[PDB]
Amino acid sequence: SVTTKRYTLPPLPYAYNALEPYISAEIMQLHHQKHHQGYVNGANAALEKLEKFRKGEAQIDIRAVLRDLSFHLNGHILHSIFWPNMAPPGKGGGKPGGKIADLINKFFGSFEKFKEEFSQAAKNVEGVGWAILVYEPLEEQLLILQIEKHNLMHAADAQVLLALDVWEHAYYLQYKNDRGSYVDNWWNVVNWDDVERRLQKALNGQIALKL
Amino acid sequence: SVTTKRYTLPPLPYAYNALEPYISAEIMQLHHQKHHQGYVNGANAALEKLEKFRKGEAQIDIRAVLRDLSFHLNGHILHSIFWPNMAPPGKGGGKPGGKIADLINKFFGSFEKFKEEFSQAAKNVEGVGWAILVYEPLEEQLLILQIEKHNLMHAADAQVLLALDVWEHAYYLQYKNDRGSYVDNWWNVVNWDDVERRLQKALNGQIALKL
Amino acid sequence: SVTTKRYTLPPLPYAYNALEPYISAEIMQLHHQKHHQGYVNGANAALEKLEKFRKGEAQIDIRAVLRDLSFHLNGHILHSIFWPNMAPPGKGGGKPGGKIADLINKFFGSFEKFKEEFSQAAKNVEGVGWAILVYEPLEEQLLILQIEKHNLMHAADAQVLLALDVWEHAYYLQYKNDRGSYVDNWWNVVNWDDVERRLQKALNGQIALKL
Amino acid sequence: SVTTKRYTLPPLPYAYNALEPYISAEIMQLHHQKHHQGYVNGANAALEKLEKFRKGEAQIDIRAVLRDLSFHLNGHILHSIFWPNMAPPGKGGGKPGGKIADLINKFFGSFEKFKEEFSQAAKNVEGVGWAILVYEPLEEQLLILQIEKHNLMHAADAQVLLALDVWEHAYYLQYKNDRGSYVDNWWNVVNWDDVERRLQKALNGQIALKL
């Protein structure tokens, strides 16, 4: 009668040390195996409370549980995008070509200016959060957003094409307090094929999470 | 070399008095003409700052503007979905039908369990916000979420199918502090024909807009 | 043994129509009997869950209950300060004198500038919240702060001297969406004797409550 | 003429290695020199913008700057309390005594229970934040609260007695993702005599700073 779909941790698209020297192998493991894994569990934990409520098996503090859901569900959605959003230098890094390159110049004027806006947004996230590029469906335009925690300030219905995680656990062991150096080096592992992939879908008015 | 798409206030699908005595014509007028117009304006003002920045004609407080943009943009998107999510009683109200009646019963067990979860999320919003129903694309399931202000707690990439505004200006003039009764009466105007259309687009792997 | 002190709704320092034509009696009535009461209620409810928890008598989602407590407790504290912060025209309105007038000139240049900063802080709160003037103990200076909801952005240890509620239920019935007109008119009922007493307590290194 | 009072980084009460093995000297150094210095700097940076606005020397995005001031000011105040809140094993650690130990039993029943409520609040702060024990003046009782970032959820006028920093930079280099071990190991350096004195102030209806 009542059914909820559960989440699972996606395997990384590469080896934990594949992004070195930009992101340490130890961070990659902790980030993937501990942090991302925790969001998957948190999402299911909240979903199970909701199912128990829906089955009439228990009451519920809907505000608390839905806050839990949003936080965890987003941590998971964003980390799922983050991993394939990167790749070993070669497949990753460099300048973008294709539609993503076109649209970037169109809305930002140049790749460099796009990097400035995105990198500055990432470096200036207050507390933990992300810097992301989304395709805005309503008026069809690229927009860079700052995200606090994992769920604050997303554009309703918008599709995340590229995300940069600036939660301290995403860089501290390697870069320490120097988030800025992390943000700058990260450009060396960005997978534009992945981003172009998602842009291809969003451009057609599609959701661009899978593939 | 740099462009930013602007937003405009969408026309209501009906007269202001269309939802009475569920939502007064005064509230409908203010909410739309004043409040919603404000969000369109705020979003555009933020873009103007970004456009200037991207052109190099000016600097920018990226955190400030991205926080601004996120707020107003969501205010605009959610209200644009909010209006067609309702209709003059007869065309609005009743119960769900179609793929949405099927999914609601699938994930919640019944329409009454759904109405209970959604209504409680709405009534239990802390401060000003919304109670929404979205299609979650990663595990393809329907979820109800609480949104604080206009931009807090959205699920990245998810498609908003049904939105219920619980900001005081959506009900106070009529129901005063009784947000609970505002919530209960609201179901008598829900345009389930609109929600179904949105779910159909969502299921096609499309964005729940422009349809 | 375990005991928690509970909160109670304090009486207004004047009748429900004492602030007209600046704040209608209906607003004052609702805001006091319904809203403020709701916060007192919320704080005690949260404390009853904590007490049960401390008596080993129950379990607890510490994040959910402490989030509830902080919001409601601040709602109560701020409203408790808000009522005596005003007074029927005569005792309220005009410019400040005594120490507060002095400190205001010292830190803002003049009362006119202060009122500018304060009104703009209040007119620009995003969503519901407050504009508050506090005495910063650490470095001894006046500061105006924006508060979102009742608990977001307060300065640790600081003493609230003057509070202006910009939640819609504090002005909507009369000013509708013109919060600005509301804020401008609010200066006519500001009980500067109250502000002064609180500042003097702060200056004394004391908590600015109870007179 | 307007003046603002600037903030300065306070020296630690002990050597950087003075709290090992519980908190590494690298953390202490980075935490103090980079992070705390950043908040003081950020607080002052906001004051500079506020100062010229008051001197009619420029315009101001009041929401932007007051949001900035709240975050940085709180970071400075809370860290300023955080440092003396700890002490090298000997002067720090063990259980409380005097008034604080006595009050912890009144409101929590036992030190054991208090430790559970405080530990659970700190381990369960969503994102980055603090767990704090304050003295709530209005009804005169000990309350534990969760703080997100440095400025969300504080209780107006409340005096912070003991603060625990759970921002990842406060532990990640040593404890990695295990916030739980960090929280548990921290008690071993708590300066109960400090919490005692601040409680004395609060009990004296005074502000708990500069002593």
Side-chain angles (χ1 to χ4, degrees):
Chain A
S1 189
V2 171
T3 181
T4 69
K5 285 291 294 299
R6 297 313 171 72
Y7 299 81
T8 77
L9 181 74
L12 229 48
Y14 36 70
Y16 288 121
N17 75 317
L19 306 187
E20 303 251 24
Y22 306 108
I23 303 174
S24 82
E26 171 172 32
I27 286 184
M28 294 304 309
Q29 193 212 65
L30 283 167
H31 201 175
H32 185 253
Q33 285 178 42
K34 296 294 184 283
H35 297 289
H36 191 173
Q37 181 63 63
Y39 304 135
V40 177
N41 307 328
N44 294 319
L47 280 165
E48 191 49 60
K49 300 186 181 184
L50 284 164
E51 196 181 297
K52 281 180 173 61
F53 161 65
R54 293 171 184 172
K55 288 184 185 183
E57 281 163 37
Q59 277 296 65
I60 198 177
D61 190 314
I62 196 62
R63 178 170 62 217
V65 176
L66 289 193
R67 281 171 159 170
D68 290 336
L69 178 59
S70 174
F71 176 74
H72 289 109
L73 175 74
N74 277 114
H76 179 49
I77 290 162
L78 290 179
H79 276 90
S80 292
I81 297 173
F82 188 54
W83 308 135
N85 233 191
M86 306 182 285
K91 200 298 184 304
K95 303 173 175 299
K99 297 309 296 67
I100 186 53
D102 286 329
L103 291 173
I104 278 181
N105 305 316
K106 172 185 174 183
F107 295 114
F108 297 81
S110 73
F111 178 49
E112 301 56 51
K113 167 62 65 169
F114 157 69
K115 281 186 61 180
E116 175 184 354
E117 193 172 318
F118 192 108
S119 297
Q120 291 315 304
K123 295 182 177 187
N124 286 284
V125 161
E126 186 176 73
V128 295
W130 310 60
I132 63 175
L133 171 66
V134 305
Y135 171 72
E136 204 296 290
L138 183 58
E139 281 313 333
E140 315 181 358
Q141 73 176 314
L142 289 179
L143 289 176
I144 291 181
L145 293 179
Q146 271 195 162
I147 273 46
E148 274 179 46
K149 288 204 292 194
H150 289 141
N151 59 334
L152 307 189
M153 310 199 328
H154 280 296
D157 285 350
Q159 304 302 299
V160 183
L161 315 183
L162 180 61
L164 170 48
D165 185 3
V166 288
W167 274 64
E168 303 187 296
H169 64 252
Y171 62 77
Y172 221 82
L173 290 179
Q174 192 180 330
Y175 302 82
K176 315 309 170 64
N177 61 282
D178 193 5
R179 166 187 296 179
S181 283
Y182 162 64
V183 171
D184 296 323
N185 258 339
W186 167 80
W187 294 106
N188 293 111
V189 296
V190 171
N191 178 181
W192 299 105
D193 283 311
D194 178 81
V195 183
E196 167 71 341
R197 214 113 57 193
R198 305 175 192 275
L199 174 59
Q200 290 289 11
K201 279 168 164 283
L203 225 41
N204 183 209
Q206 297 173 259
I207 296 176
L209 204 180
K210 302 282 190 178
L211 190 64
Chain B
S1 194
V2 174
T3 68
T4 69
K5 294 287 298 177
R6 299 313 173 73
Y7 304 74
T8 71
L9 184 69
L12 288 172
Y14 40 57
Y16 298 137
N17 57 83
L19 297 309
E20 312 228 18
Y22 302 113
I23 303 179
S24 73
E26 167 168 56
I27 280 171
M28 294 300 321
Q29 166 189 291
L30 288 166
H31 205 160
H32 184 263
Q33 301 192 316
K34 304 289 186 178
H35 297 297
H36 192 175
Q37 176 69 63
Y39 304 129
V40 168
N41 293 327
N44 288 323
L47 299 173
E48 204 65 74
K49 285 196 186 73
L50 282 161
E51 186 178 302
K52 300 287 183 47
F53 166 69
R54 298 174 187 174
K55 285 175 182 177
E57 309 184 321
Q59 262 302 66
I60 200 171
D61 183 327
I62 201 52
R63 221 217 319 284
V65 186
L66 291 192
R67 278 169 165 174
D68 291 345
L69 178 54
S70 181
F71 174 77
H72 286 125
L73 180 48
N74 280 111
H76 179 43
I77 301 175
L78 295 174
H79 274 89
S80 297
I81 295 170
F82 183 64
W83 306 136
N85 264 168
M86 301 179 295
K91 170 170 172 51
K95 281 191 162 62
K99 298 291 297 69
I100 182 54
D102 304 329
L103 300 196
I104 283 179
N105 258 62
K106 186 188 169 193
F107 299 112
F108 302 81
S110 56
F111 178 56
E112 290 64 71
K113 173 51 64 176
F114 163 78
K115 262 177 53 62
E116 201 214 317
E117 189 172 313
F118 187 103
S119 281
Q120 278 306 290
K123 299 170 183 177
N124 296 309
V125 165
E126 191 171 72
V128 284
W130 307 69
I132 60 176
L133 172 61
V134 317
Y135 165 76
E136 202 293 294
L138 190 46
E139 284 302 313
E140 319 179 345
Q141 75 183 308
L142 288 186
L143 290 177
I144 290 170
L145 293 173
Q146 258 187 175
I147 294 291
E148 283 193 33
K149 285 200 286 186
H150 290 133
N151 51 336
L152 307 173
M153 301 193 291
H154 279 296
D157 281 17
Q159 297 310 298
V160 176
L161 316 175
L162 176 50
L164 170 56
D165 187 354
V166 290
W167 274 65
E168 297 183 306
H169 62 232
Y171 64 84
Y172 220 79
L173 286 174
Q174 192 181 329
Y175 304 78
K176 271 76 173 192
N177 54 301
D178 201 339
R179 181 200 286 181
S181 290
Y182 160 57
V183 172
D184 301 335
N185 286 312
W186 174 79
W187 302 105
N188 300 133
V189 306
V190 178
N191 180 183
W192 286 108
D193 296 302
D194 179 74
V195 185
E196 174 73 327
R197 278 195 285 276
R198 296 182 190 286
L199 174 56
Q200 214 70 71
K201 287 211 61 183
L203 292 183
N204 293 340
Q206 305 174 301
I207 297 171
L209 296 171
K210 313 309 179 65
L211 210 294
Chain C
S1 173
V2 173
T3 62
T4 67
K5 311 282 182 55
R6 300 317 174 70
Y7 303 79
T8 55
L9 192 76
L12 287 187
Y14 38 67
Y16 284 130
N17 77 313
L19 307 193
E20 310 188 306
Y22 302 111
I23 295 180
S24 75
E26 175 176 50
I27 281 176
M28 295 302 301
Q29 178 189 189
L30 291 175
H31 200 178
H32 189 222
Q33 310 181 314
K34 298 304 179 184
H35 299 300
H36 188 165
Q37 184 64 64
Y39 306 135
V40 174
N41 285 3
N44 293 321
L47 287 173
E48 189 59 60
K49 297 176 186 168
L50 285 164
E51 187 170 292
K52 256 68 162 304
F53 175 64
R54 291 165 191 162
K55 293 171 180 180
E57 301 184 307
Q59 272 282 60
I60 202 178
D61 177 318
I62 197 59
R63 180 166 62 247
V65 189
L66 292 189
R67 282 177 161 170
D68 289 349
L69 175 54
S70 174
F71 169 83
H72 287 134
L73 176 50
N74 278 100
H76 177 49
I77 294 166
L78 293 186
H79 280 83
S80 293
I81 292 164
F82 184 59
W83 307 133
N85 249 189
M86 305 180 287
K91 184 168 191 173
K95 310 204 186 328
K99 286 292 298 191
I100 188 55
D102 307 325
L103 283 180
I104 272 169
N105 290 310
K106 181 185 180 189
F107 298 114
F108 307 87
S110 73
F111 170 61
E112 300 63 38
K113 173 61 68 176
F114 161 79
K115 179 168 166 183
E116 190 203 336
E117 190 168 317
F118 194 99
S119 296
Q120 282 313 296
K123 289 174 186 168
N124 290 291
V125 166
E126 172 170 284
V128 296
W130 308 68
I132 62 171
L133 168 72
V134 300
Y135 174 68
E136 204 294 279
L138 201 51
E139 284 310 332
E140 306 158 64
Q141 73 181 308
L142 288 181
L143 294 174
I144 287 174
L145 300 172
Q146 274 197 167
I147 300 297
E148 305 195 313
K149 289 200 277 179
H150 301 130
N151 57 333
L152 308 185
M153 301 195 288
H154 279 293
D157 286 9
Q159 296 306 295
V160 177
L161 311 186
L162 174 60
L164 172 51
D165 190 340
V166 288
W167 276 64
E168 300 186 308
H169 64 225
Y171 67 79
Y172 212 86
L173 291 184
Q174 194 185 314
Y175 300 76
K176 278 60 179 301
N177 63 292
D178 200 342
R179 169 199 288 178
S181 175
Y182 160 63
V183 174
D184 289 4
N185 241 355
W186 171 81
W187 290 106
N188 298 103
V189 292
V190 175
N191 181 178
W192 286 110
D193 294 322
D194 183 70
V195 184
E196 181 78 335
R197 284 194 288 288
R198 289 175 195 293
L199 172 57
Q200 192 51 248
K201 293 204 70 177
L203 291 175
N204 298 341
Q206 313 171 311
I207 291 312
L209 289 175
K210 65 192 291 178
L211 201 288
Chain D
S1 175
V2 351
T3 65
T4 58
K5 303 210 63 53
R6 296 307 169 79
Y7 299 96
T8 61
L9 182 69
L12 293 179
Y14 36 70
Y16 286 121
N17 61 46
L19 298 186
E20 301 216 51
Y22 311 108
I23 303 175
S24 77
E26 210 197 322
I27 292 175
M28 296 308 289
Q29 189 153 310
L30 287 176
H31 202 176
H32 185 240
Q33 308 185 181
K34 307 308 175 185
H35 301 297
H36 192 173
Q37 188 57 66
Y39 309 132
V40 170
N41 288 6
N44 291 337
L47 293 171
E48 185 52 64
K49 305 175 185 178
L50 284 165
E51 210 187 68
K52 64 168 35 51
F53 159 67
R54 294 172 191 178
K55 299 188 184 310
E57 286 174 47
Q59 292 316 299
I60 198 176
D61 181 350
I62 198 65
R63 182 164 66 254
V65 173
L66 297 193
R67 272 173 166 174
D68 289 3
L69 178 69
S70 177
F71 176 82
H72 281 124
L73 176 58
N74 271 125
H76 168 43
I77 297 175
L78 287 174
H79 278 82
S80 291
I81 294 165
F82 184 60
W83 305 135
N85 250 177
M86 304 183 281
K91 177 176 59 185
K95 295 195 175 180
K99 306 290 298 66
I100 182 57
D102 286 32
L103 278 51
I104 283 174
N105 291 334
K106 176 171 178 180
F107 301 109
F108 304 88
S110 61
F111 176 67
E112 285 60 55
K113 175 54 59 173
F114 157 80
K115 190 163 184 169
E116 200 205 335
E117 191 165 317
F118 194 103
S119 294
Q120 276 305 286
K123 296 180 204 303
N124 296 285
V125 160
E126 172 174 284
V128 288
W130 312 66
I132 66 173
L133 169 61
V134 309
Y135 184 78
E136 200 294 286
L138 198 46
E139 287 303 325
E140 288 161 39
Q141 77 181 308
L142 288 182
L143 292 180
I144 288 179
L145 300 170
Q146 263 192 174
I147 299 299
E148 274 185 36
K149 293 204 289 187
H150 304 129
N151 57 335
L152 312 178
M153 305 192 286
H154 279 294
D157 297 339
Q159 296 302 295
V160 179
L161 306 180
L162 179 62
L164 170 57
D165 193 337
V166 284
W167 273 66
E168 299 179 325
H169 64 220
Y171 64 81
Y172 217 95
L173 284 177
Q174 189 188 321
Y175 296 87
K176 315 287 192 306
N177 62 301
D178 195 6
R179 175 188 289 176
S181 286
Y182 160 65
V183 173
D184 289 341
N185 238 24
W186 167 84
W187 296 100
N188 296 156
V189 298
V190 173
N191 190 172
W192 287 109
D193 294 320
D194 177 76
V195 185
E196 178 74 308
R197 198 148 51 272
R198 296 176 189 283
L199 169 62
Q200 259 307 308
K201 307 294 294 185
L203 282 176
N204 293 344
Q206 302 172 183
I207 296 172
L209 288 175
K210 307 171 168 301
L211 239 286

